[PDB]
Amino acid sequence: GRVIRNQRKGAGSIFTSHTRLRQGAAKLRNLDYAERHGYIRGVVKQIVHDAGRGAPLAKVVFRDPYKYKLREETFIANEGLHTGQFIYAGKKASLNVGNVLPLGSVPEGTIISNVEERPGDRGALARASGNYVIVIGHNPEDNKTRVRLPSGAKKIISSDARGVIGVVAGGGRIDKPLLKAGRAFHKYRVKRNSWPKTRGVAMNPVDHPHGGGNHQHIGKASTISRGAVSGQKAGLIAARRTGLLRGSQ
Amino acid sequence: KRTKKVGITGKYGVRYGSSLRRQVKKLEVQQHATYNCSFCGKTCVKRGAAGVWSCSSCNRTIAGGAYTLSTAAAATVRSTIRRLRDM
Amino acid sequence: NINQKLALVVKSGKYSLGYKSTVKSLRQGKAKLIIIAANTPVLRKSELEYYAMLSKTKVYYFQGGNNELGTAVGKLFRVGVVTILDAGDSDILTALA
Amino acid sequence: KFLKAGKVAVVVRGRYAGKKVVIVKPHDEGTKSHPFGHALVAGIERYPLKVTKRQGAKKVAKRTKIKPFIKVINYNHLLPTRYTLDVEAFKSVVSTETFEEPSQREEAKKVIKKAFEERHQAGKNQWFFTKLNF
Amino acid sequence: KALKVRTSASFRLPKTLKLARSPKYATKAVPHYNRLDSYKVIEQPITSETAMKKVEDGNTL
Amino acid sequence: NPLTKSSPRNFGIGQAIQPKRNLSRYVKWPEYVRLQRQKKILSIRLKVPPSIAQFQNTL
Amino acid sequence: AQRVTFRRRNPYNTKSNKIKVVKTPGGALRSQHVKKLATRPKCGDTGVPLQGVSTLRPRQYATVSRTKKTVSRAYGGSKSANAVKERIVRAFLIEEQKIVKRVIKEQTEAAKKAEKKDAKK
């Protein structure tokens, strides 16, 4: 057979993302001295729609504590930031929507985003629209918080990990249906190249496992082994359950 | 009154079907309408690209939700932090 | 409460609306009490509050923005800051508020 | 109250915008030529340039130089101030006749410069002689 | 002892004496006569009748 | 004395650009420096054996 | 009636290839190339078009007098008038508060040390 629609993607020629319109690497500040002891005032200069982004960005401007210069950093805007807000980042800054503490300083209950997995990652978890981590716990013996991620999957993080307080902007985007292909077109046209997806099933058995037959059907379990193979893995990979999911997640 | 009930979504005509028109109407009302500006005081317009409002007669700009200035989650989280700041 | 008292001013009493007139009347010294909204920007809040201290004037912070101060002074339009030049009938001058 | 002879306002609009000034002769209103609440204010254009020990003469003389200006300035363009800085001495120098005639304008600027160079030495009213940073 | 206190964490290559060439023989040996002489630049003039128009009438050889 | 104005500089994290302190510690050294330092350490952190050892204990 | 051609070996209707048909004093219509209309300079703080400053493509004024590049205030051909006014006010009013906080914290620390001495007694 051929290499599949979804084995090439990796190669990365076309299925590379599109980064013309794409504004900047949405990232927190780099850490230390200033913001591992006291804090610093940022200033939100712009809030700015990012093409191909779950939720708009904020050019928050700080000051280099060692040079006469400004650094501007693209934070993921949390519903609340507004141009000419004073963001405050680092240990000794307070709990406000846009400030950026380290999970340690942040009481259990709080609602955080761009949470750094490891500290110094400049953000990882809960960065897409509307999403947010909840700091569940605190293990001050071996400084590491337990944190819930939008998935649900609770997970232990270093207490020196940071994250911007508040819930992320663009919340409740997916409320709307798209209608009209075209709007799905323009969605992905601004990200990547996955859209329209032809169904294996529809294609020839050359081109994809499900393919072929005198009836469009799969004919051997769309569930697939986790220890399967590039090209074997088209259908429900490594499923536990299948079928219409009832109840909680 | 032109439209008994398609309202704004009457742009879409007979497409997409009464459920996916209804759903959108609710959020294409919300998004096309004018907030009141927290700071200015005034009330017109303005959304501009999802989660980014606004200017009325002022020019600021404010991260909000996609189709509304404040998603409910934002308001409850404002409280959550209002409570946990006070501790 | 305050809203009853500013009503008592606006009927029978002399009062100024808005910023320039406020300030005009802080510099004249006719201002005995200025009622500043909340949402009125901290700059112009702090500017009034400065002038106030030179004029030795009371600054009552109307808890609530400017659409609801206009209301409170029997106005339609929104008002960012009121002055109370004279309103001997009312009790806002006597009150700490 | 207020806006008396001393009052170290800061000009806000128009050239001297952001430069500290003294209200040498206020007028509540009434003039045919300036139909609004305006002062006559002398104040400094070029600042004293921040002297030190470890410095001197062809810099210190240079630093301690202070240009002044004189201006009729509407009260909407003066943010007035706590700080007062004294003196009746300029009032008689800075009249309404002093304005209009270009030679006479200088005559005041020549006196007021001296008066500021008097004041700035022996550190009298320091705030008024530092640049307003903005 | 009492080491060089530095400010820049960045340790750049220390500027050093870049010596110049003092070669033991000329590589070319004999300096080459002018590649492009007076006579070698301008070869033949032109006789195309419509140049001889331009010579006499426009003052352009 | 009078015109000479006392003015503190204040280096409290978010106030006034930190002044050029000695950063010797925090220099990105070149690879060869990094080697010959870390070679020294690496020797010492290792339990060295006695048949060497004695060359540290010198005259 | 009297048609006209471009001039330049760019057929295409690009911006930076904009024709304005012009009657020449031959009498025939001729095209000429409309050089791009410069947008007005703008404020640093706000989106304001900044006043008293000649438009001109960034070069067209690189050799024009600076009176035409600027206005005579505080932040000339940069910040805009009321934008500056905002930030003279804000500069000055802030500096007072920083003075006021110093006095508060000076006097409150003097009270703190007095309170501890009285508590220690």
If you write DSSP's letter for every residue of D67-129 in order, what string do you get?
-EEEEEEEGGGEE--S-----STTTTTS-TTTTTSHHHHHHHHHHHHHHHHHHHTTT-SSGGG
> In this complex, which chains have at least 3 CB pairs below 8 Å with chain D?
C, F, G
Nearest partner of A66 among F30, E9, G94, judged by Cα: E9
**Residue of chain F whose alpha carbon sits nearest to that of E4:** F24
Question: Is the CB of A68 inside 8 Å of chain F's CB atoms?
Answer: yes
**Minimal C-alpha gap between C66 and chain B (Å):** 6
Nearest to F29 among E4, E7, E11 (CB): E11
**CB distance A200 to A234 below 8 Å:** yes
Residue A236 burial (CB count, 10 A): 14
Q: Which helix (H) or strand (E) holds A185?
A: helix A181-189
Determine the longest span between alpha carbons in chain B, in angstroms: 55
Best C24, C54, C57 member to test D by mutation, with max D CBs in 10 Å, is C54
Question: Is the CB of B10 inside 8 Å of chain A's CB atoms?
Answer: no
F40 φ, ψ (degrees, to nearest 5):
-60, -55
Summary count for chain B: helices (H), strands (E): 2, 2
Query: In the beta sheet, which residues pair with residue A144?
Result: A139, A158
Residue B69 burial (CB count, 10 A): 23
Nearest partner of G21 among G40, G48, G1, judged by Cα: G1
Best G45, G70, G85, G88 member to test D by mutation, with max D CBs in 10 Å, is G88
Which alpha helices (DSSP H) does chain B contain, by range? 18-32, 72-86
Judge: A80–B63 Cβ closer than 8 Å, yes or no.
yes
Classify G22 as helix, strand or coil.
strand
- Alpha carbon D37 to chain centroid distance? 18
Q: How many alpha carbons lie under 13 Å from residue E6 in its C-beta half-sphere? A: 13
Give the pair of three-digit tokens for residue D5. Answer: 């002879």
Nearest partner of A121 among A168, A160, A166, A71, judged by Cα: A160
Residues of E in contact with F22 (CB under 8 A): 5-7
Range G16-21 contact pairs with CB under 8 angstroms and sequence separation of 24 or more:
none
Give the pair of three-digit tokens for residue A138. Answer: 């605190």
Peptide bond into E18 cis (omega under 30): no
Determine the longest span between alpha carbons in chain F, in angstroms: 73
Give the pair of three-digit tokens for residue G92. Answer: 């000055």
Cα dihedral sign, F53-F55-F56-F57? positive
Nearest partner of A151 among A184, A177, A174, A128, judged by Cα: A128
Judge: F3–D48 Cβ closer than 8 Å, yes or no.
yes
* C near E: at least 3 beta-carbon pairs less than 8 Å apart: no
**CB distance C48 to C59 below 8 Å:** yes
Q: Which helix (H) or strand (E) holds D8?
A: strand D8-11
**Stretch 69-128 of chain D: residues touching chain G, C-beta under 8 Å:** 79, 81-82
Give the pair of three-digit tokens for residue D82. Answer: 């706590």
Nearest partner of B35 among B68, B81, B73, judged by Cα: B68
Helix, strand, coil % (nearest 5) of chain E? 25, 0, 75
Counted residue by residue, chain F has a size of: 59
Question: Is the CB of D46 inside 8 Å of chain G's CB atoms?
Answer: no
**CB distance D80 to D4 below 8 Å:** no
d(C-alpha B15, C-alpha D22), whole Å: 73
Nearest partner of A50 among A74, A82, A15, A86, judged by Cα: A74
Give the pair of three-digit tokens for residue E14. Answer: 């220390």
**Residue of chain F whose alpha carbon sits nearest to that of A62:** F14
Residue E19 CB-density burial (10 A; 0-12 exposed, 13-18 middle, 19+ buried)? exposed
Residues of F in contact with D123 (CB under 8 A): 2-3
Range D44-52 contact pairs with CB under 8 angstroms and sequence separation of 24 or more:
D44/D19, D44/D20, D44/D68, D44/D69, D44/D116, D44/D128, D44/D129, D45/D16, D45/D19, D45/D69, D47/D129, D47/D130, D47/D131, D48/D120, D48/D129, D48/D130, D48/F3, D50/D130, D50/F5, D51/F3, D51/F4, D51/F5, D52/F4
Query: In the beta sheet, which residues pair with residue C16?
Result: C83
Question: Is the CB of A67 inside 8 Å of chain F's CB atoms?
Answer: yes
**Residue of chain F whose alpha carbon sits nearest to that of D54:** F4
Residues of G in contact with D10 (CB under 8 A): 88, 92
Question: Is the CB of D18 inside 8 Å of chain G's CB atoms?
Answer: yes
d(C-alpha C92, C-alpha B11), whole Å: 55
What's the first-to-final CA gap in chain G, in angstroms? 108
Range E6-12 contact pairs with CB under 8 angstroms and sequence separation of 24 or more:
E6/F22, E6/F23, E6/F24, E6/F27, E7/F20, E7/F21, E7/F22, E7/F23, E8/F23, E8/F27, E9/F23, E9/F26, E9/F27, E9/F28, E10/F27, E10/F28, E11/F27, E11/F28, E11/F29, E11/F30, E11/F33
Q: What angle do the packed helices G82-120 and C42-55 form, to 10 degrees?
A: 70
Q: Which residues contact A76 (CB under 8 A, 6 or more apart)?
A: A26, A55, A56, A57, A58, A113, A114, A123, A127, A164, A168, A169
d(C-alpha D84, C-alpha G2), whole Å: 76
Determine the longest span between alpha carbons in chain C, in angstroms: 33
**Residue of chain D whose alpha carbon sits nearest to that of C55:** D1
Judge: E11–F26 Cβ closer than 8 Å, yes or no.
no
d(C-alpha E38, C-alpha E51), whole Å: 22
Count contacts between D and F (CB, < 8 Å): 16
Q: How many alpha carbons lie under 13 Å from residue A181 in its C-beta half-sphere? A: 3
Judge: C78–B39 Cβ closer than 8 Å, yes or no.
no
**Minimal C-alpha gap between F16 and chain D (Å):** 14
Classify G91 as helix, strand or coil.
helix
Residue with tokens 């308001």: B75
Best D2, D4, D28 member to test C by mutation, with max C CBs in 10 Å, is D2
Give the pair of three-digit tokens for residue D30. Answer: 């009434």
**Minimal C-alpha gap between C88 and chain B (Å):** 31
* F near G: at least 3 beta-carbon pairs less than 8 Å apart: no
Judge: D130–F5 Cβ closer than 8 Å, yes or no.
yes
Question: Is the CB of A107 inside 8 Å of chain B's CB atoms?
Answer: yes
Give the pair of three-digit tokens for residue C15. Answer: 């009062």
Cα dihedral sign, G44-G48-G49-G50? negative
Q: Which helix (H) or strand (E) holds D24?
A: strand D20-27
d(C-alpha B23, C-alpha A176), whole Å: 6
Classify D4 as helix, strand or coil.
coil
With vertex at residue F22, the alpha carbon angle to CA F21 and CA F23, rounded to the nearest 5 degrees, is 110
The DSSP string of C34-83 is EEE-SSS-HHHHHHHHHHHHHHT-EEEE-SS-SHHHHHHTT-SS--SEEE
Q: Which residues contact B71 (CB under 8 A, 6 or more apart)?
A: A79, A130, A167, A171, A172, B64, B65
Nearest partner of A31 among A79, A78, A73, A82, judged by Cα: A73
> In this complex, which chains have at least 3 CB pairs below 8 Å with chain C?
B, D, G
Residue with tokens 């005032």: A41
Residue G62 DSSP code: T
Nearest partner of A133 among A118, A119, A151, judged by Cα: A151
Q: Which helix (H) or strand (E) holds G85?
A: helix G82-120
Query: In the beta sheet, which residues pair with residue D68?
Result: D44
d(C-alpha A40, C-alpha A73), whole Å: 13
Determine the longest span between alpha carbons in chain A, in angstroms: 72
d(C-alpha G92, C-alpha C46), whole Å: 11
Burial D69-91 (b: 16+ CB within 10 A, else e): bbbbbebebbbbbebebeeeebe
**Residue of chain E whose alpha carbon sits nearest to that of F19:** E7
**CB distance D72 to D40 below 8 Å:** yes
Residue with tokens 């004293």: D48
Burial F11-28 (b: 16+ CB within 10 A, else e): eebbeeeeeeeeeeeeee
d(C-alpha C7, C-alpha C73), whole Å: 6
Give the pair of three-digit tokens for residue G69. Answer: 């590049």
d(C-alpha G33, C-alpha C35), whole Å: 61
Judge: C78–B42 Cβ closer than 8 Å, yes or no.
yes
Counted residue by residue, chain A has a size of: 249
d(C-alpha A164, C-alpha G36), whole Å: 44
Which whole-number Å values give the CA distances from G94 to C34, F29, G78, G100, in the listed order? 21, 44, 22, 10
**CB distance G74 to G80 below 8 Å:** no
**Residue of chain E whose alpha carbon sits nearest to that of F20:** E7
d(C-alpha D93, C-alpha D40), whole Å: 11
d(C-alpha D12, C-alpha G89), whole Å: 7
d(C-alpha C38, C-alpha C32), whole Å: 19
Residue with tokens 């307070």: A94
d(C-alpha A209, C-alpha A225), whole Å: 14
G14 φ, ψ (degrees, to nearest 5):
-75, 160
Residue with tokens 């912070």: C61
d(C-alpha D23, C-alpha D94), whole Å: 10
Give the pair of three-digit tokens for residue C76. Answer: 């339609």
Classify A95 as helix, strand or coil.
coil
Question: What does the H/E/C string look like for E37-61?
Answer: CHHHHCCCCCCCHHHHHHHHHHCCC
Classify C20 as helix, strand or coil.
helix
Nearest partner of A95 among C81, G118, B82, judged by Cα: B82
**Minimal C-alpha gap between D81 and chain C (Å):** 8
d(C-alpha A165, C-alpha A41), whole Å: 15
**CB distance D56 to D93 below 8 Å:** no
Question: Is the CB of D54 inside 8 Å of chain F's CB atoms?
Answer: no
d(C-alpha D120, C-alpha G3), whole Å: 75
d(C-alpha B3, C-alpha B80), whole Å: 42
Task: Provide residues of F within 8 Å CB-CB of chain A.
Answer: 12-14, 17-18
Judge: D2–C27 Cβ closer than 8 Å, yes or no.
yes
User: Resolution for this model in angstroms, one decimal place?
Assistant: 3.6
Nearest to C29 among D2, D37, D79 (CB): D2
Nearest partner of B38 among G4, D48, A85, G6, judged by Cα: A85
Question: Is the CB of D133 inside 8 Å of chain G's CB atoms?
Answer: yes
**CB distance B48 to B56 below 8 Å:** no
Question: Is the CB of G88 inside 8 Å of chain D's CB atoms?
Answer: yes
d(C-alpha F49, C-alpha G51), whole Å: 81
Residue with tokens 């207020």: D2
Question: Is the CB of D61 inside 8 Å of chain G's CB atoms?
Answer: no
Judge: F3–D51 Cβ closer than 8 Å, yes or no.
yes
d(C-alpha A205, C-alpha A196), whole Å: 19
d(C-alpha D12, C-alpha D96), whole Å: 22
Judge: B41–C80 Cβ closer than 8 Å, yes or no.
yes
Q: Which helix (H) or strand (E) holds G87?
A: helix G82-120
Residue G119 DSSP code: H
Nearest to D79 among G73, G81, G89 (CB): G89
Which alpha helices (DSSP H) does chain F contain, by range? 31-45, 50-53
Identify how the structure was determined.
cryo-EM
d(C-alpha A128, C-alpha A26), whole Å: 11
Counted residue by residue, chain D has a size of: 134
Peptide bond into B45 cis (omega under 30): yes
Nearest to D1 among C23, C29, C47 (CB): C29
Q: Which helix (H) or strand (E) holds G98?
A: helix G82-120
A237 φ, ψ (degrees, to nearest 5):
-75, 125
Judge: C47–G89 Cβ closer than 8 Å, yes or no.
yes
Q: Which one-letter amino acid corresponds to residue D107?
A: E
Q: Which one-letter amino acid corresponds to residue E53?
A: K
Dihedral angle of Cα A95, A98, A102, A106, to the nearest 10 degrees: 30
Residue D127 CB-density burial (10 A; 0-12 exposed, 13-18 middle, 19+ buried)? middle
Q: What angle do the packed helices C19-27 and C42-55 form, to 10 degrees?
A: 20
Cα dihedral sign, A16-A20-A24-A26? negative
d(C-alpha D21, C-alpha D38), whole Å: 13
Nearest to E9 among F23, F30, F33 (CB): F23
Question: Is the CB of C20 inside 8 Å of chain D's CB atoms?
Answer: yes
* D near A: at least 3 beta-carbon pairs less than 8 Å apart: no
Nearest partner of B36 among D58, D41, D53, C39, judged by Cα: C39
